RNA sequence: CUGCUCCUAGCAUGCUACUACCGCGUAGCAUUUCCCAU
Protein backbone atom coordinates (compact mmCIF):
# COMPACT_ATOMS: atom_id res chain seq x y z
CA UNK A 1 0.00 0.00 0.00
CA UNK A 2 1.40 3.55 -1.00
CA UNK A 3 1.46 6.20 1.82
CA UNK A 4 1.46 9.79 0.16
CA UNK A 5 2.78 12.63 1.73
CA UNK A 6 2.94 16.39 1.21
CA UNK A 7 5.78 18.20 1.23
CA UNK A 8 6.20 21.86 3.02
CA UNK A 9 6.67 25.13 0.78
CA UNK A 10 9.82 26.91 0.32
CA UNK A 11 11.15 30.27 2.04
CA UNK A 12 12.00 33.64 -0.22
CA UNK A 13 14.08 35.45 2.44
CA UNK A 14 15.14 38.73 0.00
CA UNK A 15 11.19 39.91 -0.43
CA UNK A 16 11.15 38.98 3.51
CA UNK A 17 13.93 41.68 4.22
CA UNK A 18 12.79 43.81 1.76
CA UNK A 19 8.98 43.83 3.28
CA UNK A 20 10.53 44.34 7.08
CA UNK A 21 12.91 46.74 5.94
CA UNK A 22 9.50 49.54 4.77
CA UNK A 23 8.36 48.87 8.11
CA UNK A 24 5.84 46.12 7.93
CA UNK A 25 4.73 43.17 10.18
CA UNK A 26 5.00 45.39 13.36
CA UNK A 27 3.17 44.52 16.28
CA UNK A 28 -0.59 45.45 16.53
CA UNK A 29 -0.83 46.17 12.63
CA UNK A 30 -3.98 45.50 10.98
CA UNK A 31 -1.72 42.88 8.71
CA UNK A 32 -0.12 39.45 8.89
CA UNK A 33 0.35 36.45 7.73
CA UNK A 34 -2.45 33.72 7.42
CA UNK A 35 -1.51 31.80 4.00
CA UNK A 36 0.96 29.02 4.39
CA UNK A 37 2.18 25.86 2.79
CA UNK A 38 0.57 23.06 5.36
CA UNK A 39 2.30 19.71 5.85
CA UNK A 40 0.48 16.45 5.60
CA UNK A 41 1.79 13.14 7.23
CA UNK A 42 1.33 9.96 5.77
CA UNK A 43 -2.15 8.26 6.00
CA UNK A 44 -4.22 11.46 4.81
CA UNK A 45 -5.50 10.26 1.59
CA UNK A 46 -7.93 7.66 3.32
CA UNK A 47 -8.57 10.18 6.39
CA UNK A 48 -9.67 12.66 3.80
CA UNK A 49 -11.52 9.53 1.58
CA UNK A 50 -13.26 8.60 5.09
CA UNK A 51 -15.49 11.97 4.49
CA UNK A 52 -17.66 10.42 2.05
CA UNK A 53 -19.43 8.35 4.99
CA UNK A 54 -21.65 11.75 5.15
CA UNK A 55 -23.51 11.15 1.88
CA UNK A 56 -27.22 9.19 2.62
CA UNK A 57 -30.17 7.84 0.71
CA UNK A 58 -32.79 10.30 0.61
CA UNK A 59 -36.23 10.81 -1.14
CA UNK A 60 -37.46 13.87 -2.33
CA UNK A 61 -41.03 14.33 -2.78
CA UNK A 62 -41.88 13.91 -6.31
CA UNK A 63 -44.49 16.42 -6.26
CA UNK A 64 -43.03 19.93 -5.73
CA UNK A 65 -39.63 18.35 -7.17
CA UNK A 66 -40.98 18.12 -10.87
CA UNK A 67 -42.46 21.70 -10.20
CA UNK A 68 -39.47 22.87 -9.22
CA UNK A 69 -37.68 21.47 -11.85
CA UNK A 70 -40.04 22.69 -14.41
CA UNK A 71 -39.41 26.11 -13.30
CA UNK A 72 -35.56 25.68 -13.56
CA UNK A 73 -35.64 24.61 -16.68
CA UNK A 74 -37.87 27.88 -17.42
CA UNK A 75 -34.97 29.71 -16.67
CA UNK A 76 -32.08 28.34 -18.92
CA UNK A 77 -34.26 29.20 -22.27
CA UNK A 78 -31.59 31.78 -23.37
CA UNK A 79 -28.83 29.46 -24.87
CA UNK A 80 -28.31 26.30 -27.19
CA UNK A 81 -27.24 22.83 -26.91
CA UNK A 82 -26.63 19.70 -29.57
CA UNK A 83 -24.19 16.90 -30.86
CA UNK A 84 -21.26 18.14 -32.58
CA UNK A 85 -18.73 16.25 -34.56
CA UNK A 86 -15.00 15.89 -33.65
CA UNK A 87 -13.83 18.46 -35.92
CA UNK A 88 -15.65 21.39 -34.25
CA UNK A 89 -14.65 20.17 -31.10
CA UNK A 90 -11.83 22.38 -29.02
CA UNK A 91 -9.14 21.08 -26.59
CA UNK A 92 -7.26 23.49 -24.16
CA UNK A 93 -3.93 21.91 -22.78
CA UNK A 94 -3.81 18.68 -23.96
CA UNK A 95 -0.16 18.15 -22.16
CA UNK A 96 -1.99 16.71 -19.17
CA UNK A 97 -3.06 13.58 -17.41
CA UNK A 98 -5.40 10.53 -18.59
CA UNK A 99 -7.02 7.92 -15.69
CA UNK A 100 -5.80 4.94 -14.23
CA UNK A 101 -4.97 2.61 -17.36
CA UNK A 102 -3.28 5.37 -19.65
CA UNK A 103 -1.40 7.25 -16.90
CA UNK A 104 1.20 5.39 -17.56
CA UNK A 105 1.96 6.35 -21.28
CA UNK A 106 2.11 9.84 -22.26
CA UNK A 107 -0.47 12.47 -21.89
CA UNK A 108 -3.83 13.24 -23.25
CA UNK A 109 -2.23 14.59 -26.18
CA UNK A 110 -0.96 11.04 -27.59
CA UNK A 111 -4.37 9.51 -27.86
CA UNK A 112 -6.04 12.50 -29.01
CA UNK A 113 -3.54 12.46 -31.95
CA UNK A 114 -3.60 8.68 -32.28
CA UNK A 115 -6.86 7.89 -33.17
CA UNK A 116 -8.34 9.92 -36.28
CA UNK A 117 -11.67 11.56 -36.43
CA UNK A 118 -13.81 8.55 -37.33
CA UNK A 119 -12.30 6.93 -34.24
CA UNK A 120 -13.66 9.33 -32.11
CA UNK A 121 -16.90 9.18 -34.41
CA UNK A 122 -17.27 5.60 -33.47
CA UNK A 123 -16.61 5.63 -29.79
CA UNK A 124 -19.21 8.55 -29.35
CA UNK A 125 -21.60 6.42 -31.57
CA UNK A 126 -20.85 3.59 -29.72
CA UNK A 127 -21.82 5.06 -26.11
CA UNK A 128 -24.95 6.00 -27.19
CA UNK A 129 -25.87 2.23 -27.09
CA UNK A 130 -23.75 0.28 -24.59
CA UNK A 131 -22.44 1.23 -20.64
CA UNK A 132 -18.42 1.90 -20.22
CA UNK A 133 -17.61 2.12 -16.18
CA UNK A 134 -14.44 3.96 -15.49
CA UNK A 135 -11.98 4.13 -12.69
C1' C B 1 -10.76 20.06 -14.83
C1' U B 2 -13.34 24.77 -16.30
C1' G B 3 -13.28 29.99 -16.76
C1' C B 4 -10.39 34.93 -16.71
C1' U B 5 -5.91 37.74 -17.47
C1' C B 6 -0.75 39.07 -18.45
C1' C B 7 3.72 38.53 -21.24
C1' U B 8 6.71 36.66 -25.09
C1' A B 9 7.83 34.61 -29.72
C1' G B 10 6.56 33.07 -34.38
C1' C B 11 3.37 32.71 -38.45
C1' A B 12 -0.20 34.21 -41.63
C1' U B 13 -3.65 37.40 -43.49
C1' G B 14 -5.88 41.99 -44.33
C1' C B 15 -5.36 47.16 -44.78
C1' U B 16 -2.50 51.86 -44.97
C1' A B 17 1.67 54.78 -46.14
C1' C B 18 6.58 55.45 -48.41
C1' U B 19 10.59 54.27 -52.30
C1' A B 20 12.35 52.52 -56.91
C1' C B 21 11.71 50.75 -61.86
C1' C B 22 8.60 49.33 -65.68
C1' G B 23 5.11 49.64 -69.20
C1' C B 24 0.51 51.37 -70.29
C1' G B 25 -2.99 55.21 -70.89
C1' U B 26 -3.60 60.48 -71.50
C1' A B 27 -1.96 65.29 -72.16
C1' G B 28 1.67 68.99 -73.45
C1' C B 29 6.05 70.42 -75.63
C1' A B 30 9.89 69.68 -79.14
C1' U B 31 12.86 67.22 -82.86
C1' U B 32 14.78 63.93 -86.39
C1' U B 33 14.39 61.80 -91.06
C1' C B 34 13.14 62.59 -95.34
C1' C B 35 12.25 57.05 -100.88
C1' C B 36 14.17 56.56 -106.49
C1' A B 37 14.89 50.93 -110.68
C1' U B 38 12.77 45.38 -111.92
Given at each position: ?100 P ?6 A ?16 A ?10
Amino acid sequence: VAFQTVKPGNFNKDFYDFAVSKGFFKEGSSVELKHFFFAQDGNAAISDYDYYRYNLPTMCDIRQLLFVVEVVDKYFDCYDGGCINANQVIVNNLDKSAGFPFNKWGKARLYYDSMSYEDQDALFAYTKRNVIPTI
